[model samples]
Target: SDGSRHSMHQVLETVYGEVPATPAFKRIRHNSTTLATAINTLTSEELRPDRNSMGIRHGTRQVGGEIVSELSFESLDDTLEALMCGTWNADALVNGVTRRSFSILRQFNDLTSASLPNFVYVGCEYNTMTLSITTEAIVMATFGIVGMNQLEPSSTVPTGATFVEAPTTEPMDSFTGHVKEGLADIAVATELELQIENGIAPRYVIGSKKSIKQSIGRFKVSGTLTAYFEDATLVGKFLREEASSLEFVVTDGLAGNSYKFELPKIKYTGGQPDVGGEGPITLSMPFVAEYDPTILGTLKITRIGA
Candidate 1:
């Protein structure tokens, strides 16, 4: 039961953000109007805003009168119910992926009971238009808590000896889940060991192998990416204002090798080298394929026992 409640709460909090604020609001007014009134009205609404975002199909109401979908719980339940009773009919995709039209033929019982990851293959015949409303904010708000003795405030409050109880909510779990080492595969233009730099080592570096187990942990969403490197620093400079650009280096792991990366801290526009000028280079994910003794980027890779 905790799992069910915990999951529900996590989803709700992420979609809604937090609902509290601190820091005294200053009063300011324009056109001979007192500023205090304007700030007071907005602050009051924030403290206790009207709630009009609950319904069976429509999800929790968001700021600016938006109705975002809550598919994790309600949608899953509805689909499962109809599927079990054999009364469901509609082309649907799961998580914006995985079509389900080609799934009805095979009995769902066998499909679910099988060791394979249960899935529904959708067909093209079932064409459906889905409407989704979502909002993306660069940043909403953030706060921190520190013990009174550990607080680094600038000054003390004026002669008021009243002790104010801190405002804090139950900490978000933000726990890391299980992590499994995945796989990636790549292919070279020439299968035979041919020399590119006049019989010398080729400038391109590529390989794959079993990733360290501890690098990925359960409840965590971790992914690996393989990128080509000719000159990453130039690309970094072209993308950021920082005069200093970090360079990517290859490090040898205990059993394999990994790309040691120091991404640019500053945000930049335009483009630069290593990542630009599309020179027949292709980047991929995971980079390590299964059932292999060594990690080499020279073949097609797929998840093993995923």
Candidate 2:
């Protein structure tokens, strides 16, 4: 009776198919009895600049800011795919986490849920603000970090220690900053081979934002893979050979106004995955993220409107 609108609406009925009756959910239990805390709990290496920023090690060449976000899962192997494909929104960033991050959750049968670690978490900061932000913009800031690496548990270079330069193309300022506004450029590239058994090829950058005056862009990866560590010791080392970096700059494209970059919190899997997911045939582990927040820096737009 309501024309096409009625056609667009459908009922919320379950369709009958070959589905599991008691869909088993991956069970991950947490128990933190003893507390050991650090003054600064997190860190990230500044991603490298594009070829344009190759001349110097200064922030001038940085194309994206180092962002911190978290990912966790039920099974270490199952959620690895979700870490690669999960959808993210900024609500999880500025405010906190949500079930979407839990898309990495998995289901299990007879596995000893006891061996399951207590926590699964991952966090990173991104650059994506060049304008005044809106409530809607805050909500739009979240995105996925795909194909990054699980550094070897005991590599000389720690995870999130240093920035890698961008490899191929130099991106234009998709957006610009204003005198009272600033921009954030966020980037993500796959770090698959560092931990994958078979191998990962052709690592690529994932996300980037420039001149986020008011808008905020959030990038997240699920908690680190539990197997990558044993009693806090790293199991598989991150192979930096394939790692690429992101740059964060305040360019004249937005009047070159000086702005401040702030990082409120950076979460990581202290010892476990933050989110978990499982499948019928495949088991995906969480993304292992090690952070050293000191290395990640921001660009200051000291002069503006030039």
Query: Cα RMSDs of all predictions?
Result: 26.5, 27.4
Listed in order, each prediction's TM-score against the native is 0.14, 0.15
Candidate 1 least-lDDT 10 residues = 191-200
Best by lDDT: 2
Overall lDDT per candidate, in order of appearance: 0.19, 0.21
Candidate 1 error regions (>4 Å)? 1-42, 46-150, 154-221, 227-278, 286-306
Task: Give one digit per residue, the lDDT tens place, for model 1 in 1-306.
Answer: 111111010010111122112211111110111001000011222232466433333212111111122222112222222211122223211111111111111111232223332111111011211111112211111111100011111222212222222112121111121111112212111101100000111011133111111111111111133333432432443334433212122212122222121222212234322444656443332211121122111111111110
